[PDB]
Amino acid sequence: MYTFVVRDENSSVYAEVSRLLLATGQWKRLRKDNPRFNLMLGERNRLPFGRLGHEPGLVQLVNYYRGADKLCRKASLVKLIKTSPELSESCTWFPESYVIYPTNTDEREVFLAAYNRRREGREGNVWIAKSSEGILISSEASELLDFIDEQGQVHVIQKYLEKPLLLEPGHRKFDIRSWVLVDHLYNIYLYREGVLRTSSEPYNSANFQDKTCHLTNHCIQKEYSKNYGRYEEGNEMFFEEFNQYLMDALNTTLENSILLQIKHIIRSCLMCIEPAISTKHLHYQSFQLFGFDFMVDEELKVWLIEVNGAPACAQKLYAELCQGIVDVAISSVFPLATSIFIKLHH
Amino acid sequence: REIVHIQAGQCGNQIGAKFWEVISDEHGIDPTGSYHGDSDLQLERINVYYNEATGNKYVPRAILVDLEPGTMDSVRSGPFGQIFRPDNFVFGQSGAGNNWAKGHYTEGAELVDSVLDVVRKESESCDCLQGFQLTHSLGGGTGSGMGTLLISKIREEYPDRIMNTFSVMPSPKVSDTVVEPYNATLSVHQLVENTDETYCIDNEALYDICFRTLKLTTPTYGDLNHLVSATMSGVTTCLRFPGQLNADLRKLAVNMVPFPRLHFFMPGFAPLTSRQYRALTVPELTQQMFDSKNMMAACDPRHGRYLTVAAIFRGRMSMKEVDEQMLNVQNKNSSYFVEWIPNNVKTAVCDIPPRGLKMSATFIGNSTAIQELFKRISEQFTAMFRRKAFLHWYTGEGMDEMEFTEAESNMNDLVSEYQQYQDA
Amino acid sequence: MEVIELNKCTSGQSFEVILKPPSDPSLEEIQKKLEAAEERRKYQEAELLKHLAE
Amino acid sequence: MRECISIHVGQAGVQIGNACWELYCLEHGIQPDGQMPSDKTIGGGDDSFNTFFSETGAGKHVPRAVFVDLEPTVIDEVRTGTYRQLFHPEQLITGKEDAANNYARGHYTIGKEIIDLVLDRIRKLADQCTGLQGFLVFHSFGGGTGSGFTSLLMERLSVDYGKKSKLEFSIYPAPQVSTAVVEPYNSILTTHTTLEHSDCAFMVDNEAIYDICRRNLDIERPTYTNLNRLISQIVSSITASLRFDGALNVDLTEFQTNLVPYPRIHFPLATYAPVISAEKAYHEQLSVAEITNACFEPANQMVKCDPRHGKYMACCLLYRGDVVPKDVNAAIATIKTKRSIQFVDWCPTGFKVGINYQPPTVVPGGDLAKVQRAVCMLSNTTAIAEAWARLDHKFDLMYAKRAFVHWYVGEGMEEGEFSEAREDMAALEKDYEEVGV
Numbered sequence A: 001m002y003t004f005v006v007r008d009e010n011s012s013v014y015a016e017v018s019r020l021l022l023a024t025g026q027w028k029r030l031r032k033d034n035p036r037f038n039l040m041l042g043e044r045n046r047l048p049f050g051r052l053g054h055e056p057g058l059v060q061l062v063n064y065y066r067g068a069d070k071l072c073r074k075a076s077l078v079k080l081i082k083t084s085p086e087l088s089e090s091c092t093w094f095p096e097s098y099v100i101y102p103t104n105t106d107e108r109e110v111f112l113a114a115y116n117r118r119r120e121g122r123e124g125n126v127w128i129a130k131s132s133e134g135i136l137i138s139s140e141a142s143e144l145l146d147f148i149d150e151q152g153q154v155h156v157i158q159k160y161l162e163k164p165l166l167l168e169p170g171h172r173k174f175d176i177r178s179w180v181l182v183d184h185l186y187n188i189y190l191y192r193e194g195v196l197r198t199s200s201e202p203y204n205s206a207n208f209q210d211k212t213c214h215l216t217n218h219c220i221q222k223e224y225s226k227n228y229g230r231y232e233e234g235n236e237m238f239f240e241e242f243n244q245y246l247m248d249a250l251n252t253t254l255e256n257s258i259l260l261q262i263k264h265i266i267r268s269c270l271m272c273i274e275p276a277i278s279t280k281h282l283h284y285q286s287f288q289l290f291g292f293d294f295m296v297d298e299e300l301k302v303w304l305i306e307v308n309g310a311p312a313c314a315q316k317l318y319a320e321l322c323q324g325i326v327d328v329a330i331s332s333v334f335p336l337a338t339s340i341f342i343k344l345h346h
Numbered sequence B: 001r002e003i004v005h006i007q008a009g010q011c012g013n014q015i016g017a018k019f020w021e022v023i024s025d026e027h028g029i030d031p032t033g034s035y036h037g038d039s040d041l042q043l044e045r046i047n048v049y050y051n052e053a054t055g056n057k058y059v060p061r062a063i064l065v066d067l068e069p070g071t072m073d074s075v076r077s078g079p080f081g082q083i084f085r086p087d088n089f090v091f092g093q094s095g096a097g098n099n100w101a102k103g104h105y106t107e108g109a110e111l112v113d114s115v116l117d118v119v120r121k122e123s124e125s126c127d128c129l130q131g132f133q134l135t136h137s138l139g140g141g142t143g144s145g146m147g148t149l150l151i152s153k154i155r156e157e158y159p160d161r162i163m164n165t166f167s168v169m170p171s172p173k174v175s176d177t178v179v180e181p182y183n184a185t186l187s188v189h190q191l192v193e194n195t196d197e198t199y200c201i202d203n204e205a206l207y208d209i210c211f212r213t214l215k216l217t218t219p220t221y222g223d224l225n226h227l228v229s230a231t232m233s234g235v236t237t238c239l240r241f242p243g244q245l246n247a248d249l250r251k252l253a254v255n256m257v258p259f260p261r262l263h264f265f266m267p268g269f270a271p272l273t274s275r276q277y278r279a280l281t282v283p284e285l286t287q288q289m290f291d292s293k294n295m296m297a298a299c300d301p302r303h304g305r306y307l308t309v310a311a312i313f314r315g316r317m318s319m320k321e322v323d324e325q326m327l328n329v330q331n332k333n334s335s336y337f338v339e340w341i342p343n344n345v346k347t348a349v350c351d352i353p354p355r356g357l358k359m360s361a362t363f364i365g366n367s368t369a370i371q372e373l374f375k376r377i378s379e380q381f382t383a384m385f386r387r388k389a390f391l392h393w394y395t396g397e398g399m400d401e402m403e404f405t406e407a408e409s410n411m412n413d414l415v416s417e418y419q420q421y422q423d424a
Numbered sequence C: 001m002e003v004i005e006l007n008k009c010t011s012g013q014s015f016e017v018i019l020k021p022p023s024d025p026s027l028e029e030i031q032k033k034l035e036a037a038e039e040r041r042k043y044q045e046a047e048l049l050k051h052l053a054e
Numbered sequence D: 001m002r003e004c005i006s007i008h009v010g011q012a013g014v015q016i017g018n019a020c021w022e023l024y025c026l027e028h029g030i031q032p033d034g035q036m037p038s039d040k041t042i043g044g045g046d047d048s049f050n051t052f053f054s055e056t057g058a059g060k061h062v063p064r065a066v067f068v069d070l071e072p073t074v075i076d077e078v079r080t081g082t083y084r085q086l087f088h089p090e091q092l093i094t095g096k097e098d099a100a101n102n103y104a105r106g107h108y109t110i111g112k113e114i115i116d117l118v119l120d121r122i123r124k125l126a127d128q129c130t131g132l133q134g135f136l137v138f139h140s141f142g143g144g145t146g147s148g149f150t151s152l153l154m155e156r157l158s159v160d161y162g163k164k165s166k167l168e169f170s171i172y173p174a175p176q177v178s179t180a181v182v183e184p185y186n187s188i189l190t191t192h193t194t195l196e197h198s199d200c201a202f203m204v205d206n207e208a209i210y211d212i213c214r215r216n217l218d219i220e221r222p223t224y225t226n227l228n229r230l231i232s233q234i235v236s237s238i239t240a241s242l243r244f245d246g247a248l249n250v251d252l253t254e255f256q257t258n259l260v261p262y263p264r265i266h267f268p269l270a271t272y273a274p275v276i277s278a279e280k281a282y283h284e285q286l287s288v289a290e291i292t293n294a295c296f297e298p299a300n301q302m303v304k305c306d307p308r309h310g311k312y313m314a315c316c317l318l319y320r321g322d323v324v325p326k327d328v329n330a331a332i333a334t335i336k337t338k339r340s341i342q343f344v345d346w347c348p349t350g351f352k353v354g355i356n357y358q359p360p361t362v363v364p365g366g367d368l369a370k371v372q373r374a375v376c377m378l379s380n381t382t383a384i385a386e387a388w389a390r391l392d393h394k395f396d397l398m399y400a401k402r403a404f405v406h407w408y409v410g411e412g413m414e415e416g417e418f419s420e421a422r423e424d425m426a427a428l429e430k431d432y433e434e435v436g437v
Ligand SMILES: Nc1nc2c(ncn2[C@@H]2O[C@H](COP(=O)(O)OP(=O)(O)OP(=O)(O)O)[C@@H](O)[C@H]2O)c(=O)[nH]1
Pocket: D009, D010, D011, D012, D013, D015, D016, D070, D098, D099, D100, D101, D102, D139, D140, D141, D142, D143, D144, D145, D146, D147, D171, D172, D173, D174, D177, D178, D179, D180, D183, D206, D224, D225, D227, D228
């Protein structure tokens, strides 16, 4: 019998993993501070990696990759993409971005050098700003940095994707969430199911102070949007409907137009940081579930916007995905008495 | 280094004689005090329990005490009786009548100075005396009353040495007189104040072990003392045998006792033997020794939590297997080990096994379920004391009901202290 | 990556390799502390012995 | 030439010292009676091995070494063992009763009683020195003597030799071989009192040595002897620049200068490779590149931690055997490309390297095999502070209930020394964190 410990009660995915583990009858849960665990579903902040792996007679395994924050917080990820040769500043799937610190290293003096060449060349010059609520999409810089300095934390501002792919009927934006599980061996597994978090308001390319047809957050759509759920239940179109739409309207497959680029981008990013975070020869082992967020443009080209390191699922898919985490992340290390993941290797 | 051993009373002396027999065998010493064993390990630390005398003789560093000569004479005529130095026999004539007050206050005071004279002689012939172990019963008269009187005297003359006791707890299933709760309670009050470490040897437990599992239909004191001499040899092996852990009484006190009052230990032994052929496997040994059915103190360990555990393995076996098995118990039952004392279970191995065993395991647990024992005594105390029953035997010797009330309170406080950490 | 201060001899050599530039109390107080703890100890012993006298 | 005096305190220090001086003697060709034929300068000299051995008129080479323990059973084994003739009796100092796993007993109650004797005997060593440069002090964190007596002796050495360097080799506690439940307390106490009296300290985590001995030596349940012979190897690797011809780490001061920029953070991480069983029938010999790469596997560190999630402040490579610089810089280049090695702002990204062409001497009959080349990397990474975290957390669990505090107080220590020590360590932990993240 294996023992685990839960340190993030506010995690939907792992609350369901805890329930599934007990159900086997081969996993008992201990108190959050008992160090004689096999498995830690750690806290999201200041997880005590240094205390893992020092219990004799216990193989110990944790649901985060120490160092994975470098991919999963926005300025960190920009820094990683620019400075890492494997991705390079010539990266063709990540938008132009820059790291700006408030008034109170910084890149706004390098920003302006590109922004003014965008305004002179008479190119679309919309730029978005955000850090890791408080979003500004603007057409001229003096709105952007002015807003950044009213807040007090590091910000990234990046080339807004002016020509996105719009779903018809409705002429609306969306983002694609892929769920990726990296196990203790560093197998990269992409879950067969993704989701399209859409917008319920036709895309208004006029004034960029309305965030209802430009930002695709499940929260800002239930409350402040007109017809939340008119086209799909909860603003969420899954992969079958979207493949079917791609075939009918655009004469292609989701696999061919989009997925191939996504599988490339995932594998890029993870293989890039693998030597810094891998636990292959460590005294404790790591797996981690990641949420890659993608935006497709009107030319069927995929772009990576955020990597989230503590992601929630879609109520329909919690069961299958959390059962998969158990199968390939947890039972692989602690075995009990047709896979839903695509393995990414090349 | 040196240990000075005291046995007091009928019960004290009987289990002490058996102890000296057993370890005198284990160290190759015969009833005449001449060494006749083969190996080396038998003599490396022989001086912890024995003095060397003329002609390469070994004399146990032991003082025999009683208020009546019956049991002392029995020991002299007993198997190893002539191994002790006769001057170390200190006895009265009048007896103590199962009366704590007589042993502590009237009859025993008359005899206590000469006992301390012999103690003094034994200690000044020590190179570095570590402390004393006293064997006695808590329900009798001499053992409980005069032994606890001895103990506090000893504490006064040697306040920087360790006081350790094997204390046999009275039980109605094995009972001589009705006043045994009284005596017990008055003793426990003493012990919680003047011992560093006390092995609670419950006669209830010993009876149940002889009955339910050894299948002995009518257990005698002998059947009980065989378990006792087994357990004593176990819990002192790391004292008298050279090991990697090179242990003494003060280290055991330091590491087993988080708080000074909670020094009452639950001992256990495996395999449980009667006075066999199948070798025990290390996993067997390891989960018999943790079994409630192997503990000499009658308490359910699952009814509280372990503060500390020491576990000794005797015999030739796989250190690796013992390590693994000990860890499986802790990791599979970590509910019952307090988390605020990290790595509270320590293990020792001694190559030499006891007589008649390929491999054995001995258990020393400091658990809050020991409270059950004291609660038992306290209930038995109160049922009489709420009617002042049998008190006259005590007030006849000069005692006051007040002293009883104070002993009772202190033991109740002791139980509460254990309950405080059972929920921490 | 440049190799500097190479010093070498019949038992071995040593050198440096750069890959990138840069981006108490007195004897008095001690014996006072030791004797302070001796005093607390002697006081706890006196406390004990007086109690044992009672 | 400047001499070094080794002081071994407690069981752990004394048995490790036994190990190291056995190794030392094999290495300099010093026989068990103290005779070194290659030494033509009879009765004296200012040779490099003389920093650790003094010479008698009779050609006997005698360790500049004191062994001190509060009970006699371990040093008695020195007095009757193979190398009894090596040591002059008044260098072996024993008491009568140990400190019973209690820092307060060793620092206060018993230490006071035996500190002035020890200091006198060390002075008799120092008085045989033309230009003493300082001390190498070996001791456990866990034991009563090892923690308590050591920090008292460190304080007093800072007084009686205030311009001399003091280096520690300290055994950090691990449960697979630990002898006491109160070892986190002693570890925090002795670290807080010693911190300002120690210029550089090499921590060795028993958990690490144990695992190294299980994985690489196929020893199923390692003994102190196993552990010590491997630790002596590492210690010999560290001190060889003091006992041999060379230009790197020639004096104790050079260890501070090369490994310890901030004075408080004076805990280098030792990593050693290769460690190869003697019972390996078919072993093939690892390249310079292979062993310099193993220097960055956490399974080869003296302390299990992850330098990838820290920063370096210093790095030194000590090779022994068939090694030339160019193979060194080859392996460095490729490793820099394939590994996470981040230095702090204000530090050069670089390696101070030392080579000594004689391969590691191994104890005949031991568990370790000769290899043609070996290396020890001393790196001042902030990741070693992980260890302090583990320790402090254990400390905290116990002290929250004042469990076992009573034993210390009863020796004359004040409860406030507990918080004070813990209080400093939380300082230390923060220094590491700000220097490193
Ligand atoms: N590596 C190694 N560790 C040892 C050795 N001996 C003891 N230890 C460790 O040291 C710690 C115990 O400290 P000791 O040095 O034995 O204690 P002491 O210094 O003798 O102090 P007291 O015996 O309490 O008076 C534990 O963590 C042991 O595992 C040894 O020979 N080698």
